[PDB]
From a paper:
The mammalian orthoreovirus (reovirus) σNS protein is required for formation of replication compartments that support viral genome replication and capsid assembly. An important finding from our studies is that mammalian orthoreovirus σNS has RNA helix-destabilizing and RNA-annealing activities without requiring a metal ion or ATP, which makes this protein an RNA chaperone.
To provide additional evidence for the role of domain-swapping interactions of the N-terminal arms in forming oligomeric assemblies, we engineered a deletion construct, σNS-ΔN17, by truncating the N-terminal 17 residues of the protein. The σNS-ΔN17 mutant formed dimers in solution and also crystallized in the presence of bile acid derivatives. The σNS-ΔN17 crystal structure determined using molecular replacement showed a dimer formed by a central core identical to that in the structures of Se-Met or native σNS-R6A with two bound bile acid moieties. As expected, no helical packing was observed in the crystal structure. Therefore, the structure of σNS-ΔN17 suggests that the N-terminal arm and the core of WT σNS operate as independent structural units, and removing the N-terminal arm does not alter the dimeric association of the core. Furthermore, the σNS-ΔN17 structure showed that bile acid derivatives bind to the same location in σNS as the N-terminal arm in the σNS-R6A structure, suggesting that this location in the σNS core domain has an affinity for cholesterol-like molecules and that binding to such molecules disrupts filamentous helical assemblies by competing with the binding of the N-terminal arms. As anticipated, RNA-binding capacity and oligomer formation of σNS were abolished by the removal of the N-terminal 17 residues and, concomitantly, the σNS-ΔN17 mutant did not have RNA chaperone activity. From our studies, deletion of the N-terminal arm of σNS abrogates dimer-dimer interactions and precludes the formation of higher-order multimers.
Author numbering: 19 to 217, 230 to 366
């Protein structure tokens, strides 16, 4: 059963079965798990690295086009939500990273300045893996970032925001949306960290790999995470008003729990995702997708949840928001 056919992250499939009159669900969340894999650039490309250019040429062949194909091509996606936030700035980045002309940057980001955030992350993540997906169907080899190799053994990653209370890098709740970290020359990103680990055990922070070589790659990895957040937020905003698509699943409670897990990925870098996840644990996750949509649109209000009263800290490789002898949110690290 297809859900969100023309979405990138929400794109999911549901298989339902009966074994002696017992109701069984299975939800297959597709593009989402593809998108978060981009925290390990080489692991993402590992697949496509051993597919030739015919993999792409047979796609630009078609006239149907659709979302899943435009994504693979790293092009803007009509029939899907798109953003224009700091599009000017993002186009400059493409030209710098891939060292190409403005005429080619305009292929990725039209004059419209509308683009799919997950189609840029894929582009940059593939770029960090040493493959540039070009304007005209092709894979061109570019230098493989040493950072991408340095992280290619890690199976856990936990992004979080930090500040300083005096002389200690201390985790904080997000104040801003992910969308605001991209602007101002991407200088917001300094206050993001990503903790990687094996097994957490071998915990190593991406900010502790800071080097004049890796600084370029370290920023792109963060940008790709922010962009995948933007995509998720766009699709939830669009899903809210797509009353047609919404009605396919409005009562499928096991799906609300799945959307909750998806937002949890971004609940430490995006204030709206934070508040949205906090509200659902308060309700114990047993929520209709129609009500969940209402909670998503509610979370857009800063006063929706009292973030200011919550104490943030890390323990055991997991992110905790709590107050008054009772935790409100646990966020676990992202697989791969
Ligand atoms: C947390 C502090 C800023 C003080 C603060 O808490 N402000 C929160 C706020 O902006 O509201 C920032 C400012 C300078 C940062 C460092 C510099 O940008 C240089 C360098 C940049 C790297 O992107 C991440 C490591 C780090 C050492 C950074 C770690 C951390 O990112 C620092 C030490
Ligand atoms: C932070 C990284 C790496 C800087 C570095 O090489 N070492 C710094 C150091 O170690 O001292 C740089 C490399 C290319 C930069 C981008 C490009 O120059 C294009 C464009 C230029 C604008 O001035 C600010 C936004 C940005 C997207 C830039 C943001 C950011 O400024 C980038 C992504």
């Amino acid at each position: 059963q297809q859900v969100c056919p023309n979405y990138v992250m929400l794109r999911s499939s549901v298989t339902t079965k009966v074994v002696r009159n017992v109701v069984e669900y299975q939800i297959r969340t597709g593009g989402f798990f593809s998108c978060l894999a981009m925290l390990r650039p080489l692991q993402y490309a590992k697949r496509e690295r051993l597919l030739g250019q015919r993999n792409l040429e047979r796609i630009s062949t078609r006239d149907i086009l659709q979302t899943r194909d435009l994504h693979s091509l790293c092009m803007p996606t009509p029939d899907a939500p798109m953003s224009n936030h700091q599009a000017s700035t993002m186009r400059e980045l493409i030209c710098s990273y891939f060292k190409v002309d403005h005429a080619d940057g305009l292929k990725y980001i039209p004059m419209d300045e509308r683009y799919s955030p997950s189609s840029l992350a894929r582009l940059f993540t593939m770029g960090m893996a040493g493959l540039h997906i070009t304007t005209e169907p092709s894979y061109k080899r570019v230098p493989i970032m040493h950072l991408a190799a340095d992280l290619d053994c890690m199976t856990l990653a936990l992004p979080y925001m930090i500040t300083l209370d005096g002389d200690t890098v201390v985790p904080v709740a997000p104040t801003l949306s992910a969308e605001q970290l991209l602007d101002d020359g991407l200088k917001g990103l300094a206050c993001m960290d990503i903790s990687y680990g094996c097994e957490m055990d071998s915990s190593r922070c991406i900010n502790e790999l800071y080097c004049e070589e890796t600084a370029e790659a370290i920023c792109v990895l963060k940008t790709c995470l922010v962009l995948n957040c933007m995509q998720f937020k766009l699709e939830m905003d669009d899903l809210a008003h797509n009353a047609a698509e919404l009605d396919k699943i409005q009562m499928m409670i096991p799906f609300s729990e799945r959307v909750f897990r998806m937002a949890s990925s971004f609940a430490t870098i995006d204030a709206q995702c934070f508040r949205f996840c906090v509200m659902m644990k308060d309700k114990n996750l047993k929520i209709d997708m129609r009500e969940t949509t209402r909670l998503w649109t509610r979370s857009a209000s800063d006063d929706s949840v009292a973030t200011s009263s919550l104490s943030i800290s890390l323990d055991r490789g997991r992110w905790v928001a709590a107050d008054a002898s009772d935790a409100r949110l646990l966020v676990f690290p992202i697989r791969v």
